[PDB]
Design a protein around this ligand. Structure first.
Ligand SMILES: Cc1cc2nc3c(=O)[nH]c(=O)nc-3n(C[C@H](O)[C@H](O)[C@H](O)COP(=O)(O)OP(=O)(O)OC[C@H]3O[C@@H](n4cnc5c(N)ncnc54)[C@H](O)[C@@H]3O)c2cc1C
Ligand SMILES: NC(=O)C1=CN([C@@H]2O[C@H](COP(=O)(O)OP(=O)(O)OC[C@H]3O[C@@H](n4cnc5c(N)ncnc54)[C@H](O)[C@@H]3O)[C@@H](O)[C@H]2O)C=CC1
Ligand SMILES: Nc1nc2c(c(=O)[nH]1)N[C@H]1C(S)=C(S)[C@@H](COP(=O)(O)O)O[C@H]1N2
Ligand SMILES: O=c1[nH]c(=O)c2[nH]c(=O)[nH]c2[nH]1
Ligand SMILES: O=c1[nH]c(=O)c2[nH]c(=O)[nH]c2[nH]1
Ligand code: MOS
Ligand code: FES
Ligand code: FES
Ligand SMILES: [Ca+2]
Lengths: 1291, 99, 50
């Protein structure tokens, strides 16, 4: 037992002391040194940790290959398994695998942090199917997330495995050759022969027994009834890591043949309880293909639930019995097994029973009826009989890889040849603390016939029997009740169809989700015909690091090796929203092995006062002012020890009155600073002149950054004069450097901050990274050891702040033609517990409240609400998206009120070339009308509007919507002094050039663009130029990499440094005009001419004043238009993003591959902001949603199915570097086209079932999630379910 | 630095050139990504030649701060540095010398 | 230099040098070296990539 023997990339691993608590991810990264596999979440959602596993399947007589999340795989399940990581398939030092080459060349890698796990999901698919279909390729990634790319390029690059200039050329792609793939390790193949034996592993806290036979298993369960079974670990992993469970003994029965046997009997197909869900899916797909339809009703319900379940990684290791016994109230399988009476065979040493699953099998929350010495041996999923029909339905927040809001299995059995109910079972998840059956309701229908009255009676019965109190866990009370009826309705209609083997307007409600095929078109401008091949400005050059990202060679902060004496820090944070800290007791933490120290405010040698506005503590002292407020930190010898000791630090609090919401803040006058305001013209006059006045209120929820790499710092104390060198995932080396200095109380010249790259920043690393950096620095200072900390996702989401939620009160005056005449908007943001960037964020909101519309009388105000929540910060858009959204909302209301088509109303209000904005800045080179016209045409908007009306006429329970919206976004930091940039350039004597500049790489391709710029300027190939990193000792006093201006400003500084070099070289060039760059550089060097210089740029003519409402706030504006169409399911709240067309003005792109990627990536973040992503807080201000399981960003399947992007031709922008425009943030608001398309669809649903009032204005807040969409589709079912028999009623 | 006190002398030089105390000035190390193409530290000439390069870089910094000094002649070094920064004046420069 | 902490994966190099003032090198046998615990590799002219 003792030894664990597996393979990694072909090489044998013998672990003599396997600890059962060690995951494969930890093992690869910390013991084997293979850092290409990443931690993104630790909970099975992001797929950044994906690896392939290969083993001999004795039982099938073949080597199988499947994917798995290394973060959830115990190394103790892997005895005699061969692991392949991203490093096992290729590298830039040898040769890229085709999978890696294509994702890199097709621009499917930006920050690169998700790239190895997506490479491994695609690689795994190819090892199983060397020639996949397009559909197989999409499904390969249900468990992979990417925050940067918008998914399109990954799918489009990989689709070349199936079967305008171009962004890439698939003709250069190496075809796949399966004969060159690494051989399954021959040593494993020899061992397949030996029969397995029980193994025992012993760790610090846990003993693991790998059971080889059923008899062994049954005896171990008799001997140790407390032992916890583990098969795939995809539940126990979570319990151990997130719910602080410790199971001192584990038995893993995964080897046992009886628990893996598949048997086709006369009543159904039996699966061993350890069979993975992917094996279940495979076997049932085969059965559905081979057997009559009438036999496979239950199977197709199982399959339908497995479709929208988890990625391939989870399905390949998650066992069928694991799901049954976990017995979550929202299991998608248990309602199906309950409604079908699926047969459970349950054993004990010398005992054995088979029972149908029914309502009694789940006695209470997360328990089943098995006793402590019983195991589930097998599950027989039954054949469907004649006259027997079955449906399963599931509705979550996102289709792919999400927790059901409501999920169900529904079965009816009729008398033979009849419509007379003999058996009826409606079993639901999400409606109690367990899977439940609606027995009261279904009992009443036995002997009734399938007709309208039965539908009405079942709906009424469900409305009564499946009550939810106001306080039900999960919330969303009305939505959930409505779904229980809505799913019955789909069942009722589906069963009518199946019995008539009626009403073409109803048939789509019965239809199972169907993928339309993707179509993607990118249109951009060719470079002039004779432009040098070496001048790559304007060409689609791939991100310089994409190949190393695809290979797992690109080094992110936590990939840097640890020093032998390096320690680990874990933050200790408030569990209360607002409280005095009474005492802190570390006496239990001190007992954890490897504990080094607990650090708190008294340990700081310099200042505890920190934050952009000096209104924060480094460590809370006396009081905490939010859940997640950092109180202290534990330092220990391993991250597990540090985390364990931090968990057991005991804080005693005394609560104070908390102010949580924007409403609490307004009521309590709890604000930062005073009101901001822009006002132009005469409001009283404008309102008195308006034909029509609408007023309202509107809310838009916040947004978590979800960078795939969470916050991370390594701090190295040098031991001399206070010196410290820090490697940090931050967009702001300068504030990191000065905040670390201020905390230590040393001069800023002592502190060196280095940033190689970030795996995403999106604004969330603009300032908030210092929360981690200053604590780690403290630890390095106090111990004199290197120290590091990388946040787990749940710490990151809680602590580091997000986008600002906004509440708006507005009043708009307009004429009956739709011309806007007066507008008043009062903005409130939820700022959290410090100022941070909240003020400048409100300023930018006010600057964008016009969007693209000329409004003669206008007043916008903004207040920052001060609350007991984590401080909110920059997030791509920086206040612009909130204000632009409020603006499109009233505009959409203007069009509805006037009864005019919305595009007419938008067009007639649009600024024209030369107009002044409400802040008196002139719009020069205003390209919105060109973007607008070209998007109308290329999207076929007009023809498509008629098609949408037709679809709507012909479908009662599905509706389509279509909407085209413009945007403009001002380019510059709104703080004038931030608009400066430095560069440092050296030419070495071989003529190679090292460029350094103040900007950071977070996936946006800044360094790529800077090398393209220096190469054009110097007239040398890019291969001679290199950027290693960003550091405070090469370029000092840098602005954070932010406001989308980094290319503009660093591009100028780089340009200037090159001009200086060119001038120093010119005499040598003159002497030897036929010589090489190398000749001139050597001659300059031998002549003692300096080949090093700085370059600098400061943006001219900027300086807006709120007091005078004049002076340029921005250098110019970036513009674009998006048209999107959606189809909503009015019965569930689900929707498809059918098609989106974008036309973006980015001037003369420096790199149209990178600029289109920025358009698509921003657009998709916008789409998530407005339709998917929602953070939930308890009323006491504790965040519920702390990982990808509950916080849902766009998935691969989320993007528009037809996705077209064009960069506007012939629009040089003379205000920036080589006529280009900033691109990073401007396109994000365009994702609101999906939100307004959705609202168009909702209006069509409401006309169908709710109202005759075609000028009705209903409130739709953001995000428009399935909850908000379904609740707005008011109909006979919502009417039965909306919350709220009295003795008397007035009247 | 190999024991001969080169950094010390360079700090004395910088402090005299900028007219600020040595305590505001620091040298951490020598590296090829901060100063490229350097001759070996040899021939006894390092104080002479790095002293001039450092002195030239300090003169450039002084020229850059000089309008801020005139606007605020009674202010501190810290005041003028912060004013130059808020005015978007670069506080970074190279210095070079050729015997 | 050597006071800088080592990385946890940091290895140590020992030069192998000539005991003869002027000679042909006939062969090099590392077979005994390879048996010393912790041996990672012997490097020579042929390993040089540039
Ligand atoms: C990213 C992700 C997405 C997911 N999506 C969904 C979803 O959409 N719908 C859904 O329903 N679930 C979902 N799940 C839950 C998932 O299906 C279960 O985690 C999985 O099937 C449990 O199987 P396992 O082998 O990993 O269980 P383990 O974690 O190994 O075991 C889980 C529990 O079952 C017990 N157990 C295992 N085998 C037996 C046995 N034969 N006899 C008695 N007890 C046993 C264990 O003791 C433990 O209590 C998701 C999980 C993840 C990580
Ligand atoms: N991680 C992932 O991405 C996914 C995981 N799975 C499953 O999701 C599970 C989620 O686990 P947890 O978040 O702990 O949720 P849980 O197992 O406690 O269930 C919470 C849900 O149960 C219901 N509920 C619980 N008590 C209730 C009550 N008293 N009254 C009414 N309703 C009640 C509500 O539907 C609530 O949303 C995972 O354990 C896994 O089994 C499924 C999809 C995705
Ligand atoms: N891949 C990727 N793209 C990104 C980001 C990112 O973190 N990753 N950040 C965005 C934000 S918030 C900004 S302000 C800009 C910053 O870079 P730029 O100034 O070079 O565009 O990039 C945008 N695009
Ligand atoms: O005016 C801005 N200031 C910032 O600090 C910032 N950060 C983000 O990208 N956008 C902006 N915009
Ligand atoms: O002329 C010299 N060149 C050197 O390279 C060197 N090194 C040493 O100090 N003295 C000298 N002198
Ligand atoms: O960095 Mo940007 S919001
Ligand atoms: S880190 Fe394993 S799935 Fe996210
Ligand atoms: S490239 Fe996918 S998360 Fe950044
Ligand atoms: Ca704030």
């Amino acid at each position: 037992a003792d030894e664990l023997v597996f393979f990694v990339n072909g090489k044998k691993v013998v672990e003599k002391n396997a600890d059962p608590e060690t995951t494969l991810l930890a093992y690869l990264r910390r013991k084997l040194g293979l850092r290409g596999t990443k931690l993104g979440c630790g909970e099975g959602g992001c797929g950044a940790c994906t690896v392939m596993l290969s083993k001999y399947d004795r039982l099938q007589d073949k080597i199988i290959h499947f994917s798995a999340n290394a973060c959830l795989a115990p190394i103790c399940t892997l005895h005699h398994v061969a692991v392949t990581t991203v490093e096992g398939i290729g590298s830039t030092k040898t040769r890229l695998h085709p999978v890696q080459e294509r994702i890199a060349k097709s621009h499917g890698s930006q920050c690169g942090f998700c790239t190895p796990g997506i490479v491994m999901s695609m690689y795994t698919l190819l090892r199983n199917q060397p020639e996949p279909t397009v559909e197989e390729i999409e499904d390969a990634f249900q468990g992979n997330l990417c925050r940067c790319t918008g998914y399109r390029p990954i799918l489009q690059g990989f689709r070349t495995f199936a079967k305008s200039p171009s962004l890439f050329n698939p003709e250069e792609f190496m075809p796949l050759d399966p004969t060159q793939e690494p051989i399954f390790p021959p040593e494993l193949l020899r061992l397949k022969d030996v029969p397995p034996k029980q193994l025992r592993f012993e760790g610090e806290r846990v003993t693991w027994i790998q059971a080889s036979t059923l008899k062994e298993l049954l005896d171990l369960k008799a001997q140790h009834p407390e032992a916890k079974l583990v098969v795939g670990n995809t539940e126990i992993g979570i319990e151990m890591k997130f719910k602080n469970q410790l199971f001192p003994m584990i038995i893993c029965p995964a080897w046992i043949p009886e628990l893996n046997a598949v048997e086709h009997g006369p009543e159904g197909i039996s699966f061993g309880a350890a069979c993975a869900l992917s094996s279940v899916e495979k076997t049932l797909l085969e059965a559905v293909a081979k057997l009559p339809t009438q036999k496979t009703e239950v199977f197709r319900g199982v399959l339908e639930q497995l479709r929208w379940f988890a990625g391939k990684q989870v399905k390949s290791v998650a066992s069928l019995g694991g799901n049954i016994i976990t017995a979550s109230p929202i299991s998608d399988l248990n309602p199906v097994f309950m409604a079908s009476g699926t047969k459970l065979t349950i054993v004990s040493r010398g005992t054995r029973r088979t029972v149908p699953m029914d309502h009694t099998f789940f006695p209470s929350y997360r328990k089943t009826l098995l006793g402590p010495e019983e195991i589930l041996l097998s599950i027989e999923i039954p054949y469907s009989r004649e006259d027997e029909f079955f449906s399963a339905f599931k509705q979550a927040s996102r289709r792919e890889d999400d927790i059901a809001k409501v999920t169900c299995g529904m079965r009816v059995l009729f008398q033979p040849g009849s419509m007379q109910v003999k058996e009826l079972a409606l079993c639901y998840g999400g409606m109690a603390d367990r899977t439940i059956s609606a027995l009261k309701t279904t009992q009443k229908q036995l002997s009734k016939f399938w007709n309208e009255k039965l539908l009405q009676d079942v709906c009424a019965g469900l409305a009564e029997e499946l009550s939810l109190s106001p306080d039900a866990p999960g919330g969303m009370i009305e939505f959930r009740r409505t779904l229980t009826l809505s799913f019955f309705f789909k069942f009722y209609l589906t069963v009518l169809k199946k019995l008539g083997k009626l009403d073409p307007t109803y048939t789509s409600a019965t239809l199972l989700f169907q993928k339309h095929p993707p179509a993607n078109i990118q249109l951009f401008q060719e470079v002039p015909n004779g432009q040098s091949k070496e001048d790559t400005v304007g060409r689609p050059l791939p991100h310089l690091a994409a190949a190393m990202q695809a290979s797992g060679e690109a080094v992110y902060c936590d990939d840097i090796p640890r020093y032998e004496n390096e320690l680990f820090l874990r933050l200790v944070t408030s569990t209360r929203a607002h409280a005095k800290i009474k005492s802190i007791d570390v006496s239990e933490a001190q007992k954890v092995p490897g504990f080094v120290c607990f650090l708190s405010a008294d340990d700081i040698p310099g200042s505890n006062e920190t934050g952009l506005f000096n209104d924060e503590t480094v460590f809370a002292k006396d009081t905490v002012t939010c859940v997640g407020h950092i109180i202290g930190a534990v330092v220990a010898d391993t991250p597990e020890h540090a985390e364990r000791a931090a968990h057991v630090v005991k804080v005693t609090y005394e609560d104070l009155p908390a102010i949580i919401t924007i409403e609490d803040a307004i009521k309590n006058n709890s604000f930062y600073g005073s009101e901001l305001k822009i006002e132009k013209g005469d409001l009283k006059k404008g309102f008195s002149e308006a034909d029509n006045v609408v007023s309202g209120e509107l809310y838009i929820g916040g947004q978590d950054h979800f960078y795939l790499e969470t916050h991370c710092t390594i701090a190295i104390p040098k031991g001399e004069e206070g010196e410290m060198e820090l490697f940090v995932s931050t967009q702001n080396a300068m504030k990191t450097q000065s905040f670390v200095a201020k905390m230590l109380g040393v001069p800023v010249n002592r502190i060196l901050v280095r940033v190689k790259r970030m795996g995403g920043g999106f604004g969330g690393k603009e300032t908030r990274s210092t929360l981690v950096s200053v604590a780690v620095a403290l630890a390095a200072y106090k111990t004199g050891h290197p120290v590091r900390c990388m946040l787990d996702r749940n710490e990151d989401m809680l602590i580091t702040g997000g986008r600002h939620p906004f509440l708006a009160r507005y009043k708009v005056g307009f004429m009956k033609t739709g011309t806007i005449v007066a507008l008043e908007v009062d903005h409130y943001s939820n700022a959290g517990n410090s100022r941070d960037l909240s003020h400048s964020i409100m300023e930018r909101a006010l600057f964008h409240m016009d969007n693209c519309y000329k409004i003669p009388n206008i007043r916008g105000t903004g207040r920052l609400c001060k609350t007991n929540l984590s401080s909110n910060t920059a997030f791509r858009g920086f206040g612009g998206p909130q204000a632009l959204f409020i603006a499109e909302n009233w505009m959409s209301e203007v069009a509805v009120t006037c009864g005019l088509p919305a595009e007419e109303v938008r067009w007639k209000n649009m600024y024209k070339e030369g107009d002044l904005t409400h802040f008196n800045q002139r719009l020069e080179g205003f390209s919105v009308p060109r973007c607008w016209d070209e998007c109308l045409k290329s999207s076929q908007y007009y023809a498509r509007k008629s098609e949408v009306d037709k679809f709507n006429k012909e479908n009662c329970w599905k509706k389509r919507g279509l909407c085209i919206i413009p945007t403009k976004f001002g380019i510059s930091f709104t703080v004038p002094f931030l608009n400066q940039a430095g560069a440092l350039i050296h030419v070495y004597t071989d003529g190679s050039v090292l460029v350094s500049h103040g900007g950071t790489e977070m996936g946006q391709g800044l360094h790529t663009k800077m090398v393209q710029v220096a190469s054009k300027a110097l007239k040398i190939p890019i291969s001679k130029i290199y950027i290693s990193e960003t550091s405070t000792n090469t370029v000092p006093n840098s602005s954070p990499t932010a406001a989308s201006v980094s290319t503009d400003i660093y591009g100028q500084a780089v340009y200037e440094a090159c001009q200086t070099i060119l001038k120093r070289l010119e005499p040598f060039k003159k002497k030897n005009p036929d010589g090489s760059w190398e000749d001139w550089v050597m001659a300059a060097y031998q002549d003692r001419v300096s080949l090093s210089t700085t370059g600098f740029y400061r943006t001219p003519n900027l300086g807006y004043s709120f007091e005078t409402n004049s002076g340029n706030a921005f250098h110019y504006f970036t513009y674009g238009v998006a048209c999107s169409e959606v189809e909503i399911d009015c019965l569930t709240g689900d929707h498809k993003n059918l098609r989106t067309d974008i036309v973006m003005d980015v001037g003369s792109s420096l790199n149209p591959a990178i600029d289109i990627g920025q358009v698509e990536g921003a657009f998709v973040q916008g789409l998530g902001l407005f339709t998917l992503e929602e953070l939930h807080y308890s009323p006491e201000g504790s965040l519920h949603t702390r990982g990808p399981s509950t916080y849902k960003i766009p998935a691969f399947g989320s993007i528009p199915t037809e996705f077209r992007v064009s960069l506007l031709r012939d629009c040089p922008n003379k205000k920036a570097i080589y006529a280009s425009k900033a691109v990073g943030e401007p396109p994000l608001f365009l994702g609101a086209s999906v939100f307004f398309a959705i609202k168009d669809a909702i209006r069509a649903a409401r006309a169908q079932h709710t109202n005759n009032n075609t000028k009705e204005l209903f409130r739709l807040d953001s995000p428009a999630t399935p909850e908000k969409i379904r609740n707005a589709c008011v109909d006979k079912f919502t009417t039965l379910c909306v919350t709220g028999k009295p003795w008397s009623l007035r009247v």
